[PDB]
Amino acid sequence: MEAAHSKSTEECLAYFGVSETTGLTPDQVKRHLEKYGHNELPAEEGKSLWELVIEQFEDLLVRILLLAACISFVLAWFEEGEETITAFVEPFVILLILIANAIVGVWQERNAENAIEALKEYEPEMGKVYRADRKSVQRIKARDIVPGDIVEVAVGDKVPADIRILSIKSTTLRVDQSILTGESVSVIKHTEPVPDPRAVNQDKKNMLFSGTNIAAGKALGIVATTGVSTEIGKIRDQMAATEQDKTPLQQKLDEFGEQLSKVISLICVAVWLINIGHFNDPVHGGSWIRGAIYYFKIAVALAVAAIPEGLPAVITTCLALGTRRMAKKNAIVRSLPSVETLGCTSVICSDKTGTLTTNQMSVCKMFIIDKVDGDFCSLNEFSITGSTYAPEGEVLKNDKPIRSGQFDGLVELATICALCNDSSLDFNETKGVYEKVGEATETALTTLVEKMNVFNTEVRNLSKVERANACNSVIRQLMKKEFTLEFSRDRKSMSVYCSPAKSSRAAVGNKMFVKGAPEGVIDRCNYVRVGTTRVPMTGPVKEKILSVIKEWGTGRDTLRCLALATRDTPPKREEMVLDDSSRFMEYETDLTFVGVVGMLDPPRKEVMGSIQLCRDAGIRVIMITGDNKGTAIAICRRIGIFGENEEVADRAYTGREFDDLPLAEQREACRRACCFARVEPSHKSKIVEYLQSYDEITAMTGDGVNDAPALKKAEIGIAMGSGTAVAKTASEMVLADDNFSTIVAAVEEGRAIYNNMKQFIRYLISSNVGEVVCIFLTAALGLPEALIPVQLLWVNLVTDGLPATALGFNPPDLDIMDRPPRSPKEPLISGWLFFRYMAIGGYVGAATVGAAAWWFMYAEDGPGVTYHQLTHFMQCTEDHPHFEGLDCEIFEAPEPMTMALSVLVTIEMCNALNSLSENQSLMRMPPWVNIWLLGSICLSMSLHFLILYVDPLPMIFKLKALDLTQWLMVLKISLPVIGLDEILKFIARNYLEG
Ligand SMILES: C/C=C(/C)C(=O)O[C@H]1C(C)=C2[C@H]([C@@H]1OC(=O)CCCCCCC)[C@@](C)(OC(C)=O)C[C@H](OC(=O)CCC)[C@@]1(OC(=O)CCC)[C@H]2OC(=O)[C@@]1(C)O
Ligand SMILES: [K+]
Numbered sequence: 001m002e003a004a005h006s007k008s009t010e011e012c013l014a015y016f017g018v019s020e021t022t023g024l025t026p027d028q029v030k031r032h033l034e035k036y037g038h039n040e041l042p043a044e045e046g047k048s049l050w051e052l053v054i055e056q057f058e059d060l061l062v063r064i065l066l067l068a069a070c071i072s073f074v075l076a077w078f079e080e081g082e083e084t085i086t087a088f089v090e091p092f093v094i095l096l097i098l099i100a101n102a103i104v105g106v107w108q109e110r111n112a113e114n115a116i117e118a119l120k121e122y123e124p125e126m127g128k129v130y131r132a133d134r135k136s137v138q139r140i141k142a143r144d145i146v147p148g149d150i151v152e153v154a155v156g157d158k159v160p161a162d163i164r165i166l167s168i169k170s171t172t173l174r175v176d177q178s179i180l181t182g183e184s185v186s187v188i189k190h191t192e193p194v195p196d197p198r199a200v201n202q203d204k205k206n207m208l209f210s211g212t213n214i215a216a217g218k219a220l221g222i223v224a225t226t227g228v229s230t231e232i233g234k235i236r237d238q239m240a241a242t243e244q245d246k247t248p249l250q251q252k253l254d255e256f257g258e259q260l261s262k263v264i265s266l267i268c269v270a271v272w273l274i275n276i277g278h279f280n281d282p283v284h285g286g287s288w289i290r291g292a293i294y295y296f297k298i299a300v301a302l303a304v305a306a307i308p309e310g311l312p313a314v315i316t317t318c319l320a321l322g323t324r325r326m327a328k329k330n331a332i333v334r335s336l337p338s339v340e341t342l343g344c345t346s347v348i349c350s351d352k353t354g355t356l357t358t359n360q361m362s363v364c365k366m367f368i369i370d371k372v373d374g375d376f377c378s379l380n381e382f383s384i385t386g387s388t389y390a391p392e393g394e395v396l397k398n399d400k401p402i403r404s405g406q407f408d409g410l411v412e413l414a415t416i417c418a419l420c421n422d423s424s425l426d427f428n429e430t431k432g433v434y435e436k437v438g439e440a441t442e443t444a445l446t447t448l449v450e451k452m453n454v455f456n457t458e459v460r461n462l463s464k465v466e467r468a469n470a471c472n473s474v475i476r477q478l479m480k481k482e483f484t485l486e487f488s489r490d491r492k493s494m495s496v497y498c499s500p501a502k503s504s505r506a507a508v509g510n511k512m513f514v515k516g517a518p519e520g521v522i523d524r525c526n527y528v529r530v531g532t533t534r535v536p537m538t539g540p541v542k543e544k545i546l547s548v549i550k551e552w553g554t555g556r557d558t559l560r561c562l563a564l565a566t567r568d569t570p571p572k573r574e575e576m577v578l579d580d581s582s583r584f585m586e587y588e589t590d591l592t593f594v595g596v597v598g599m600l601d602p603p604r605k606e607v608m609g610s611i612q613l614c615r616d617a618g619i620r621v622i623m624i625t626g627d628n629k630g631t632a633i634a635i636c637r638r639i640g641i642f643g644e645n646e647e648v649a650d651r652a653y654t655g656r657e658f659d660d661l662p663l664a665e666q667r668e669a670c671r672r673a674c675c676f677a678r679v680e681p682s683h684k685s686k687i688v689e690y691l692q693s694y695d696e697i698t699a700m701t702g703d704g705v706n707d708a709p710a711l712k713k714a715e716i717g718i719a720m721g722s723g724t725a726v727a728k729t730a731s732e733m734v735l736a737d738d739n740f741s742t743i744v745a746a747v748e749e750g751r752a753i754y755n756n757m758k759q760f761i762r763y764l765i766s767s768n769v770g771e772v773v774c775i776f777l778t779a780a781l782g783l784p785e786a787l788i789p790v791q792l793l794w795v796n797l798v799t800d801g802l803p804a805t806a807l808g809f810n811p812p813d814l815d816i817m818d819r820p821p822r823s824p825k826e827p828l829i830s831g832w833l834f835f836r837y838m839a840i841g842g843y844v845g846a847a848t849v850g851a852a853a854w855w856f857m858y859a860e861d862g863p864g865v866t867y868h869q870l871t872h873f874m875q876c877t878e879d880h881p882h883f884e885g886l887d888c889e890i891f892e893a894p895e896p897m898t899m900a901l902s903v904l905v906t907i908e909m910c911n912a913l914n915s916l917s918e919n920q921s922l923m924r925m926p927p928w929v930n931i932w933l934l935g936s937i938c939l940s941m942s943l944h945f946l947i948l949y950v951d952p953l954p955m956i957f958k959l960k961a962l963d964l965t966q967w968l969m970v971l972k973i974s975l976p977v978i979g980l981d982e983i984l985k986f987i988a989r990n991y992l993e994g
Contacts, residue, residue: 001036001147001225004164005204006197012164012222016148020166020222023130024149032146039161039226040143041120041236052109056102060257061307064264068303069094071296072789078293086956090300090790097309097793104316115712115730116239119232119705122179122211122726127160128152130220147223153208154218162230163208163221165191168579173217177201177209179705179724180231185422185439186215188486192580200680201231203489205581211705238685238709239730245715247337248344248824249315249754260306267302267772271779287874294874297789298779304789305771308764310797310804315757318808322753330736331746332721338732340757342716343750345619346821347691347698348743349684352625354720355701355740356639357601360436361444362387365559366395367548368409368595369530375540379548380409384451387602389425389443390434391450391467404452408531411454413595416513416564417445418472419479420496425450425468434468441560444599446472477501479511483578491585492517493563497570512567514588518549518596521563527592529566534592545593550630552598556644558634559598560627565591603639610741611640618820619747623675624684624701629654632677641674648675655679667693684710697824699743701735702727718743752812754822760807762829763915766837767800767908773845774900782871784891786852786900791957798943799905802936803912809932810916832992833918836984843980844907847973851903852896854969861966863890894960898948899970901959905944906974909937914981919988922978 004012016032018024024032057066073091127142130150137152142160145151152169153159165173174186181202190205201209208221210230227233246254319336326333333339353359363384370380382402386393394401404410423438425446436443446469453459453471462470480499487494493516500509514521527534528541552559567590576587614621621641625632633652636642642651652675658666670690676683684700688710691698700707700714703723708730711717717731720738728734735742771792778786829837857866863886872879876888913927927934947953948961962970988994 001229003197004222004224005194005199005207007164008193009164009166009191009222012224013166016222018148018150018222019132020150020220022132024146025132029131029146029149032148033144036147036229037227038143039145039223041116041123041233042228042240044114044117049106052106053102056105057098060254060261062098062101064261064303065094065307065309066098068300068789069098072300075293075297075300089956090788093790093793094304097797101312113729115708115726116236118726118729119211119236122158122232122705124158124160128157145223145226147226147229149223150220151223152218152220153214155214155216157214159208159210159212159214161210161223161226163210164224165189165206165208165219165221167191168217168219170217170219173219174215175208176213176215178212179726180209180212181706182704189219190579190581192582205488232705235705235709239712242709242712244712247340249340249757250337252828264302264306267776268299271776274780275782286878290874295779298775298785301785301787301789301792302772302775302779304792304796305775305787306768308768308796309793310801311761311764313797314760314764314801314804314808317805318753318757318760321808322749326746326749329745329749330721330739330742331749332734332736333732333746334728334734335732338716339750339753341697341750341824342699342733342747343752343754344697344822344824345699345716345747345750346696347620347622348614348747349622349624349687349698349714350701350718350740350743351703352623352627352635353601354703354722354738355735356607356623356635357603359440359601360387360389361440361560361599361601362389363444363448363597363599365552365557365598366410366413366448366595368407368413369528369541369545369593370409372528372530372535372538372541377541377544379544380407381548384448386447386451387600388434389436389447391425391447391470393451395452403456405454405456409529409595410452412529412566413564413597414449414452414454415475415478416515416566416594417597418449418475419481419498420484420494420513420515420564421445421472422484424472427464427468429465432464434464440601441562441599445562445597448597448599449475482510482573485578485584485587486581487516488581488584490581491588492520493588495567495584495588497573497576508568510570510573512570512588514565514567514591515562518561518563519546521565521588521591522546522593524589525565525591525593527568527590529592529594534568537593545596549596553628553631554634556634556638557598557600558631558638559600560631562597562599563593564595564597565593567591603635604739604741606739606741607639610744613744613748613817615640617744617747617751617817620674622673622687624679625675625677626679627677629675629677632675636675651675652677655683658683666690670694681706681710685713688714697821699747701740701743702731748817751816751822753808755813755816756808756810758828759810759915759918760804762833762837762918763807763912764796764800764804765829766840766911767844768796769837769841770844770848770907771795771841771904773841774848774904777845777849781849782874783849783853784856784870784873784896786849786897787904788897788958791897791901791959794947794957795901795904795908799940800908800912802940802943803909803933806930806932806936807912807915810930832988832994836981839984840911840977840981843977844904844911847903847907847977848900851970851973852900855893855896855899855966856890859895859966861895861963862893865890894954894958895962895966898959898962899966901957902944902962902967902970903973905940906970907977909940910974910977911981912937914978914985919985919994921982921985921989923982 013020069091076087076091079087124142126139127145128137128139130137145161173189175189176186178184194204211232319339322339323333350356366382368380370378383396384393395404396402421442423442423446426435426437428435450471457474459467459470480501482497482499484496493514495512495514498511525537528537549561553561571587577583611621623636623641629652633648637644642648651673653669653673655678667690670687671694688698688700697715699716699718700710701718702711703720705724705726708726711730719728719731719734721734721736722738774787855862856870857864868883873891876884913922917925947957948959
């Protein structure tokens with residue numbers, strides 16, 4: 001395996017010591033394979049349903065629950081025969097929760113798809129090699145190809161390994177590197193080595209990357225690297241080495257787990273410390289077993305009271321909902337947990353072309369020199385109407401319409417555009433529109449031609465179909481395209497050698513038409529065509545040319561410029577070696593400049609404002625383009641990244657400038673920069689790590705497989721709907737319309753989702769707090785079980801689940817985007833809020849406990865044990881002659897529990913209205929504000945009633961319907977909550993900073 005692109009064909013045949021005609025010898029193959037491994041990507045990690053299930057049972061809370069599920073299962077295995085049969089329902093349900101919860105997580109991971117797996121979609125199953133053991137070519141399994149052995153590839157074939165090309169068996173070799181480099185059009189390959197050893201893939205012209213397809217031709221080559229060593233394998237590793245943090249809310253959930261675990265434990269010690277006097281009791285097992293059974297069944301209750309068993313159910317459903325809501329807005333969220341992290345984006349890095357702009361190129365300014373008379377000079381600027389690739393528009397000089405033909409200079413310019421260009425136009429009748437056939441920038445020159453047909457060649461009486469390439473093919477027939485010197489990033493330009501065809505044109509026969517970067521080509525021009533004549537390119541004329549070139553790329557226009565020239569006396573045909581990108585630059589010299597063409601890549605409508613939104617939303621936007629920084633910066637001003645007069649010294653760098661900086665300034669640059677032009681692949685990944693060293697949540701756009709590494713490392717990777725599949729499977733979200741503004745839209749829903757999501761979480765949590773309080777008093781005072789595990793779960797999964805999810809539909813704040821990005825480390829409940837719930841729980845804990853006790857003593861239905869130890873109720877059948885002239889079974893009664901459970905239920909509907917706003921009073925933000933809320937509160941209540949009356953139910957919950965007067969008591973207990981909160985809110989509102 002090597003750096004073959006820089007090495008020559010021999011040197012490579014040398015390195016591996018393999019014969020180009022024999023290939024590797026069967027021995028060499030065994031040796032080579034055992035030294036370089038199979039040419040395949042690392043096997044998938046092996047996870048079992050077992051590990052997958054065990055993982056479900058790793059969470060701390062899930063464990064705490066599983067444990068209690070047993071204390072319960074055992075406790076229920078100790079009931080009194082017929083005194084109870086429903087005994088086994090408490091433990092059975094907790095399991096269903098855990099069983100359910102597991103089933104979810106799994107059916108969650110089986111349906112998951114690995115971004116690293118997608119890559120294997122680019123590995124052909126078979127390949128063709130030439131080995132010593134046979135005369136003719138052999139079609140083996142890609143996996144068995146080895147670095148060194150000879151391989152031949154042809155059209156259709158997907159490249160197997162990273163190959164250095166030895167000799168092209170065809171006239172030309174075209175490849176589709178789209179995925180790995182991002183060049184839609186098939187490029188041309190050669191055999192000559194590339195000097196630079198640190199070259200980027202795009203410039204390795206003698207290289208075949210594994211996974212890309214061969215568009216046209218047939219060639220032979222020696223395998224540079226295989227497996228994880230190839231260009232794609234290097235990506236697989238960056239991705240496999242990339243580790244992703246958990247959603248801040250996912251973190252908070254682990255945080256809350258550890259903590260709950262502590263508290264519960266302390267509660268136990270406290271409770272025990274409370275009933276310490278028991279160490280001063282007569283020594284004899286007077287319910288030694290009846291007392292332990294008691295605590296254990298309080299243990300299980302305490303557990304289901306501290307864990308919000310319906311919260312993950314609610315979050316998952318709120319995420320799924322908003323998700324669809326976004327799908328509507330072209331924002332396709334792949335991972336639900338992300339809708340949150342999205343909301344916290346503080347930096348968005350977007351590619352320019354496809355997403356910030358339309359990528360619908362069009363030329364709207366031309367200019368040909370009009371006169372050179374020493375120092376005096378005058379150009380001929382023009383403007384061209386139309387943004388579409390449609391052959392409709394006109395040409396104007398000072399806004400005044402013109403027939404292009406009248407200018408000789410334009411007749412030349414025009415041809416160059418049709419001849420040099422490989423792209424073309426087509427018109428699909430189904431959609432009734434003109435379509436770009438080749439590349440955006442060339443296919444533009446195509447429509448430019450059409451719109452200015454120099455010869456007036458009448459075409460009006462044509463259909464749109466044929467109208468598409470009319471004026472080009474006109475010029476296509478004039479000259480004969482002999483051969484083309486393709487584009488090369490060194491000389492930044494391409495050309496075409498042309499013959500006159502039919503005689504009478506013989507004189508000035510062979511010509512050479514060039515088009516490339518202005519500074520580039522113009523430095524190679526010794527002449528300038530003024531009409532049909534020519535004149536020595538002089539300094540004055542050159543300054544004037546390069547001056548206009550800058551107003552066009554730097555001015556409010558933000559235009560990309562193409563210099564069009566011509567070599568009048570092109571080197572003799574045979575004196576040219578048409579297969580070495582290196583010499584083409586030398587063949588494209590001694591040129592006479594004819595004129596430049598400025599085209600535009602209009603920004604999308606909804607982009608301007610989207611950029612403004614981010615300003616208000618405190619989100620930094622960083623552009624990633626291919627433009628030079630001169631125009632890059634212009635485009636950045638045009639859309640809003642920069643002000644029109646804003647300084648941009650240390651806020652816009654280029655791929656080189658950046659690299660030329662020491663790791664320190666490099667880092668410093670990233671916290672201020674916004675426009676990054678002509679950026680290599682490595683970069684996207686460095687810019688992310690730096691933005692991260694500043695604790696920022698960044699978003700990164702990408703389309704091809706080369707972006708996957710970056711995408712997988714950005715907090716939120718955004719892939720293009722039109723982009724590769726690997727790219728998509730590597731990103732958290734996809735943009736159907738590839739439109740950047742869709743990003744901003746997505747981010748806004750994230751802030752909206754987390755806002756509502758935020759509340760129902762605070763809501764379900766407080767209720768769990770109050771539930772615990774109840775249990776704590778129940779045991780701290782030795783009272784009869786006010787609330788039972790079975791009941792609690794119902795209230796936690798259903799009675800509170802409905803109000804909870806509904807709170808997820810709270811009307812979004814109007815200013816959501818006028819506030820900076822949320823801090824991930826922001827806790828959900830602290831400070832003053834901590835205290836309110838500290839107080840609310842403290843309340844319901846009292847309301848629930850007391851509600852039940854009040855039935856025992858003080859009620860007309862219940863036996864007033866009033867102001868007498870209801871508490872020592874356990875020692876009762878024995879001690880009855882003392883303080884017990886009644887039946888020791890009242891305590892098992894349902895009325896009492898059915899009391900607390902009702903006060904709990906009504907207090908949780910009340911606390912659901914208080915959760916409509918953290919600090920706004922209901923008198924201000926009335927409950928009717930969120931209809932869904934009220935609706936569910938009804939569904940909930942009726943559900944509560946259901947389990948009270950419908951016969952089968954009451955029995956298992958240990959609940960007996962209570963009459964019209966007991967109910968009124970529930971109200972006198974619950975309702976005060978609303979007031980307690982209004983007060984506590986008023987405090988926040990008024991005094992405490994707020
Ligand atoms: C389920 C409620 C029980 C009774 C409880 O013990 O929870 C407490 C504790 C886990 C939280 C605390 C809990 O604190 C309290 O209950 C104190 C115990 C009261 C004693 C009652 C007697 C039996 C949370 C629930 O508290 C509030 C008032 O509801 C608030 C906060 O949690 C939230 O952010 C939810 C996160 C998803 C936590 O805050 C703490 O105060 C910080 C501790 C270092 C919680 O602790 C953290 O994990 C936080 C940030 O999540
Ligand atoms: K990621």
